[PDB]
Amino acid sequence: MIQQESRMKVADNSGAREVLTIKVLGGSGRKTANIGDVVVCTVKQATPGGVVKKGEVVKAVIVRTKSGARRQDGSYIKFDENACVIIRDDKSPRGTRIFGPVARELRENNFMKIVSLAPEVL
Amino acid sequence: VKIRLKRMGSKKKPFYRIVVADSRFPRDGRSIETIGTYNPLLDPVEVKIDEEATLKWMHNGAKPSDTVRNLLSREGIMEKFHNQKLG
Amino acid sequence: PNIKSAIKRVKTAETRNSRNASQRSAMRTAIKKFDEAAANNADNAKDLYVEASKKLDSAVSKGLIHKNNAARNKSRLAAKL
Amino acid sequence: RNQRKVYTGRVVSDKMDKTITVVVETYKKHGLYGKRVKYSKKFKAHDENNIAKTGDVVRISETRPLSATKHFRLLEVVEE
RNA sequence: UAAGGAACUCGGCAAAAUGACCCCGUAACUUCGGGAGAAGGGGUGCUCUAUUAGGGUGCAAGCCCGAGAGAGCCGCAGUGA
RNA sequence: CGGUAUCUAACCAGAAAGCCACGGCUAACUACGUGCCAGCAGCCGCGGUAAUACGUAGGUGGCAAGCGUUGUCCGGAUUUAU
RNA sequence: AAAGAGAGUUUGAUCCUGGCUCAGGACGAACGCUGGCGGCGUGCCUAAUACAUGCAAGUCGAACGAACGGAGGUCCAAAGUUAGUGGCGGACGGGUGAGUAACACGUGGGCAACCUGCCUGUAAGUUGGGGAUAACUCCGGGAAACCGGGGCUAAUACCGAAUGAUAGAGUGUGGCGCAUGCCACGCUCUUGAAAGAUGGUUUCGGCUAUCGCUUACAGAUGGGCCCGCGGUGCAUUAGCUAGUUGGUAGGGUAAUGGCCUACCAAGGCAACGAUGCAUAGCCGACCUGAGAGGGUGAUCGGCCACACUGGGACUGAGACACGGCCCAGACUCCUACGGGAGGCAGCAGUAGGGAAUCUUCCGCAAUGGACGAAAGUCUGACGGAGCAACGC
Ligand SMILES: [Mg+2]
Ligand SMILES: [Mg+2]
Ligand SMILES: [Mg+2]
Ligand SMILES: [Mg+2]
Ligand SMILES: [Mg+2]
Ligand SMILES: [Mg+2]
Ligand SMILES: [Mg+2]
Ligand SMILES: [Mg+2]
Ligand SMILES: [Mg+2]
Ligand SMILES: [Mg+2]
Ligand SMILES: [Mg+2]
Ligand SMILES: [Mg+2]
Ligand SMILES: [Mg+2]
Ligand SMILES: [Mg+2]
Ligand SMILES: [Mg+2]
Ligand SMILES: [Mg+2]
Ligand SMILES: [Mg+2]
Ligand SMILES: [Mg+2]
Ligand SMILES: [Mg+2]
Ligand SMILES: [Mg+2]
Ligand SMILES: [Mg+2]
Ligand SMILES: [Mg+2]
Ligand SMILES: [Mg+2]
Ligand SMILES: [Mg+2]
Ligand SMILES: [Mg+2]
Ligand SMILES: [Mg+2]
Ligand SMILES: [Mg+2]
Ligand SMILES: [Mg+2]
Ligand SMILES: [Mg+2]
Ligand SMILES: [Mg+2]
Ligand SMILES: [Mg+2]
Ligand SMILES: [Mg+2]
Ligand SMILES: [Mg+2]
Ligand SMILES: [Mg+2]
Ligand SMILES: [Mg+2]
Ligand SMILES: [Mg+2]
Ligand SMILES: [Mg+2]
Ligand SMILES: [Mg+2]
Ligand SMILES: [Mg+2]
Ligand SMILES: [Mg+2]
Ligand SMILES: [Mg+2]
Ligand SMILES: [Mg+2]
Ligand SMILES: [Mg+2]
Ligand SMILES: [Mg+2]
Ligand SMILES: [Mg+2]
Ligand SMILES: [Mg+2]
Ligand SMILES: [Mg+2]
Ligand SMILES: [Mg+2]
Ligand SMILES: [Mg+2]
Ligand SMILES: [Mg+2]
Ligand SMILES: [Mg+2]
Ligand SMILES: [Mg+2]
Ligand SMILES: [Mg+2]
Ligand SMILES: [Mg+2]
Ligand SMILES: [Mg+2]
Ligand SMILES: [Mg+2]
Ligand SMILES: [Mg+2]
Ligand SMILES: [Mg+2]
Ligand SMILES: [Mg+2]
Ligand SMILES: [Mg+2]
Ligand SMILES: [Mg+2]
Ligand SMILES: [Mg+2]
Ligand SMILES: [Mg+2]
Ligand SMILES: [Mg+2]
Ligand SMILES: [Mg+2]
């Protein structure tokens, strides 16, 4: 459950290191995004020398949340943090490698490149 | 410890020094005490050797090489060493 | 490794490691028992002491300890009694 | 046998236990002018039990390392 | 009080958070006194060594004061309100 | 290495010379063209109509399968002086 | 015996002072024009940037597993010249100069405070037992690196015993020193060793040769530690330090030592430059100079440090180990998504940076290395060839 003014750390190789949410795409009155949803966001903290600079407006996808998703089989998954991967106009990441586990639901949202690079797809 | 043969001189023109050194050191590198010279180019081989420090090193356990053994045999160091061992 | 000798060397390394660790542990345990006996009361202690020295001397014959080390340990723990 | 180095200096500090500090002075040519210049270096010496007093000329001799920085022992005290 | 954490509002109003004792450590500036409890950290329970090491009191009997260390033990949590 | 070094015979002036510089420092000058332009240059500085300093031609000087330019160090520099 | 060259330029003309410029020599040099040969040498100075491809460390059947001719049964065939466990070597040889202002290097000593496989010499011995395990063969997990379980067998593989200490203690005698202590010898008790393989003879038992294995003592060799002196810029870098300074006991190492621990005292270094910042491998040596000095560390030789970055240990006489192992980090690659593999500052070679630097060659013939009793195998060390007027 991520809405505007919510911060979540970045989980790939790009220069960004923390990001604040600006808007949730999908509808006129939409107010909450979860695993597999694309958001507009800004960079609040960046590592020196990175490609992505501080104060930049970028799009990104949600890979794990503290209140995860429920599967059709009646099972649940939850993580210990909210994470984020910066993506391009298409569904390809702007970084080189992904850190930490990644939810399986992205395989159902055609995010095939991010799934391949993840160390674990839970 | 071997009484070895060190090569120097010029391209296609080798000259040799009969020298004692350790087997772990480079051929042209560190050595202990040079004792003689050996010139192969001349048809009659000219080999000069101390013949006194050589016997001391042989007594102390300095095993030579094949050609050094041949030179010591021709110059009589090996035969005198055998005589010293007998006597 | 990518040399045919290195694999044999490493295998021999684990074998020798296990063997030497076993004997070293046995010798340390013997020394520990002797010093425990010597520190508190008298009891046998001296009776233990002999075989403790044995555990050192044979060890030198095995090759897992220096002769000076064995002599030094024997003299140092011989001062407890 | 062999021999060890011996230095004759003056006791400066004797407030340690069983050991003192001794300054040894010598002269040397300069690098480019050849003038005498004083050159004082401080060593640490070992006594039997706190005999030497400050400002007393003593002769000390070389030995093995007795401590972290301690390589000399007191040979005798020439005078006060 | 789930997730978020000022997005509320004229304005963080109200509420929430810190809070005791011991130790480490502490900036620009300065009227040289300060700033300073700056900031930022670590330790607190019970049992045995142990009528302690040592102090106050008294002629002695005895009675009060109690820091460091070690070994351990129990909870999510030891200035457990 | 290797038919390699070397040696033996026959033919051939034939198949084999370039770079920098020339007012003084520093060895070595004439003509043409240009006219404070084109340009040269380490310094003194040359170029405004008679240019031994600019470009070319002839000549001369130095070196030579090399010759010039640049960068760094020492000398000249007694310009850190024992 | 050696022993040093100046010129232009401030002025209307001078003489001093003073700076600037030039005439010489040398490069791991570069660029431009040009270009015949031979001999001897040199060639990533920048990115210790990233690496395709091939080769650089293996060897012993004298300790345990081959085809043929061919005993024997017109058909198959017994015995006779060729994988792995184990031993030695991989710590040598080869490459880079990142880091390091310190016992790293040079020079001169000390160790009565030390170690050392192979090599040499000498004195003794190699006497008796045991339980296994690869290899091999079945059962499974397997995408693949490879993992487990059951059974079977050798040794110079491993582990006890007999005996043997100049190893520990206790003592004595004599001679001695540089304080701690050194040397010769004697006495009693307690511990510590081994392995056999290729032949000869003899009787066949025995005996014996060579190579082997265990212990001790010397030599030689290679290392370890300590110390005096010596080689840079900044004070617009003045205080630094607390296992620090010393002692009492202990632990540890081949050895001394706050190397490490507990206790006790508050010490120690510094204007003779402590501490800090910056640069830098050190020397023999090279260039220049009349010399004193100044600049540099190309080639070669000696020492030191490093091996993608950081940490650690095992085996071993010797490593905290370039082409060995474990963990973390960045990068490259394979995956069936569970997980695996790699390190050219080795020889050639590719990309990038540069103003700028070479063949993906031949051979162990010579010298030297490792293994073996030897033949012999390996050796991008090395011996040679190719390119570049780069130098004489
Ligand atoms: Mg030979
Ligand atoms: Mg035994
Ligand atoms: Mg030893
Ligand atoms: Mg001494
Ligand atoms: Mg809430
Ligand atoms: Mg919550
Ligand atoms: Mg805020
Ligand atoms: Mg609003
Ligand atoms: Mg607002
Ligand atoms: Mg308020
Ligand atoms: Mg404040
Ligand atoms: Mg608990
Ligand atoms: Mg030919
Ligand atoms: Mg010819
Ligand atoms: Mg003809
Ligand atoms: Mg003709
Ligand atoms: Mg001709
Ligand atoms: Mg002719
Ligand atoms: Mg002609
Ligand atoms: Mg020509
Ligand atoms: Mg002209
Ligand atoms: Mg001309
Ligand atoms: Mg000419
Ligand atoms: Mg001068
Ligand atoms: Mg001039
Ligand atoms: Mg050229
Ligand atoms: Mg040309
Ligand atoms: Mg030539
Ligand atoms: Mg380099
Ligand atoms: Mg084999
Ligand atoms: Mg080397
Ligand atoms: Mg170097
Ligand atoms: Mg057996
Ligand atoms: Mg068996
Ligand atoms: Mg068996
Ligand atoms: Mg015995
Ligand atoms: Mg005896
Ligand atoms: Mg002495
Ligand atoms: Mg005796
Ligand atoms: Mg025994
Ligand atoms: Mg033999
Ligand atoms: Mg053998
Ligand atoms: Mg010097
Ligand atoms: Mg120098
Ligand atoms: Mg001690
Ligand atoms: Mg450097
Ligand atoms: Mg030269
Ligand atoms: Mg001069
Ligand atoms: Mg040089
Ligand atoms: Mg070089
Ligand atoms: Mg060198
Ligand atoms: Mg490397
Ligand atoms: Mg690299
Ligand atoms: Mg070991
Ligand atoms: Mg290696
Ligand atoms: Mg390599
Ligand atoms: Mg290379
Ligand atoms: Mg290139
Ligand atoms: Mg060879
Ligand atoms: Mg050979
Ligand atoms: Mg090979
Ligand atoms: Mg080579
Ligand atoms: Mg070569
Ligand atoms: Mg070149
Ligand atoms: Mg040439």
Side-chain angles (χ1 to χ4, degrees), chain A residues 1-71 74-88 90-122, chain B residues 1-42 44-47 49-50 53-87, chain C residues 1-65 67-79 81, chain D residues 2 6-9 11-13 15-47 49-55 57-61 63-78 80:
Chain A
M1 295 187 63
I2 306 290
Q3 74 266 16
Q4 177 185 318
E5 298 269 329
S6 160
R7 310 219 183 176
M8 65 182 179
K9 67 184 289 184
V10 178
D12 65 336
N13 211 330
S14 63
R17 183 179 63 83
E18 183 178 1
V19 175
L20 185 147
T21 315
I22 284 180
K23 185 53 61 69
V24 173
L25 314 173
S28 72
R30 185 160 186 168
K31 65 178 72 66
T32 300
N34 54 6
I35 289 182
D37 282 356
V38 185
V39 302
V40 187
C41 47
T42 196
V43 188
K44 291 283 179 173
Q45 293 179 356
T47 182
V51 171
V52 186
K53 300 294 187 291
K54 184 177 180 180
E56 194 173 331
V57 180
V58 295
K59 281 198 172 83
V61 70
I62 312 185
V63 296
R64 78 183 85 105
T65 43
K66 275 204 48 174
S67 68
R70 56 171 305 267
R71 288 93 189 278
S75 57
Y76 297 90
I77 178 152
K78 299 196 204 326
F79 296 88
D80 214 332
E81 66 183 1
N82 307 109
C84 182
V85 162
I86 297 194
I87 61 165
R88 273 189 260 273
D90 57 347
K91 295 167 189 233
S92 54
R94 286 186 58 166
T96 300
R97 63 181 293 165
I98 320 292
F99 303 115
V102 161
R104 179 168 289 297
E105 277 91 350
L106 294 174
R107 221 201 280 290
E108 306 162 24
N109 297 93
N110 209 27
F111 287 98
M112 294 299 291
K113 182 67 181 294
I114 296 167
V115 159
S116 296
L117 286 149
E120 198 159 18
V121 175
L122 275 165
Chain B
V1 174
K2 295 183 162 180
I3 62 170
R4 185 179 296 113
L5 197 67
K6 187 152 83 167
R7 183 205 191 281
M8 65 182 179
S10 80
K11 174 182 285 188
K12 289 260 180 70
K13 305 293 266 287
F15 188 83
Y16 287 108
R17 298 181 84 122
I18 305 172
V19 176
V20 63
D22 268 339
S23 67
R24 68 184 69 188
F25 291 140
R27 174 185 76 169
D28 299 318
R30 182 153 85 181
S31 68
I32 304 169
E33 185 260 330
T34 179
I35 57 175
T37 69
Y38 166 66
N39 196 318
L41 274 299
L42 290 90
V45 289
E46 275 91 9
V47 192
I49 199 159
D50 180 71
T54 300
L55 274 185
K56 164 189 171 179
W57 286 117
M58 294 299 291
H59 273 296
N60 287 132
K63 286 184 169 175
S65 286
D66 294 349
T67 57
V68 189
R69 187 262 187 275
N70 290 318
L71 298 177
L72 296 175
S73 67
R74 290 182 205 95
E75 282 163 342
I77 297 89
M78 298 304 289
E79 202 270 333
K80 190 183 276 290
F81 197 46
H82 179 206
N83 303 319
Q84 288 201 7
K85 286 308 294 173
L86 292 172
Chain C
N2 48 9
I3 293 288
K4 202 164 89 165
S5 177
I7 60 171
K8 184 100 173 300
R9 290 304 276 195
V10 68
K11 296 173 197 177
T12 305
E14 291 91 8
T15 69
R16 293 181 184 271
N17 189 359
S18 66
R19 162 161 62 226
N20 284 96
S22 49
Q23 282 97 30
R24 276 199 290 262
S25 296
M27 155 184 71
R28 292 180 179 91
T29 45
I31 276 174
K32 188 190 81 163
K33 282 195 302 180
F34 163 73
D35 61 56
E36 268 196 6
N40 180 243
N41 286 105
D43 219 345
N44 51 5
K46 173 168 279 283
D47 189 358
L48 294 174
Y49 165 89
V50 170
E51 73 252 19
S53 309
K54 185 188 275 193
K55 299 288 95 176
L56 290 158
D57 294 320
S58 46
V60 180
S61 64
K62 257 65 184 168
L64 57 91
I65 183 181
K67 164 203 160 84
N68 309 117
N69 209 66
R72 162 169 40 91
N73 296 115
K74 283 198 308 185
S75 171
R76 271 167 153 193
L77 56 91
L81 60 84
Chain D
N2 289 120
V6 189
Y7 288 85
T8 311
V11 169
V12 173
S13 76
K15 55 167 289 173
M16 293 180 183
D17 200 301
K18 260 190 271 163
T19 179
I20 56 183
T21 59
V22 168
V23 167
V24 184
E25 285 182 349
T26 183
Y27 291 167
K28 74 166 80 72
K29 298 292 183 182
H30 203 267
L32 214 47
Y33 319 120
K35 183 176 174 49
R36 280 84 165 86
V37 176
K38 293 182 183 293
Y39 175 44
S40 65
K41 183 175 174 66
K42 315 205 303 215
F43 299 115
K44 294 189 186 295
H46 181 66
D47 61 72
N49 47 2
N50 314 288
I51 295 96
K53 296 293 122 175
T54 303
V57 298
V58 301
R59 312 189 38 238
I60 71 183
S61 173
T63 180
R64 71 159 183 259
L66 271 300
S67 161
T69 61
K70 185 176 180 180
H71 317 123
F72 286 104
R73 66 164 166 96
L74 187 153
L75 207 55
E76 74 260 19
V77 183
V78 167
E80 212 286 328

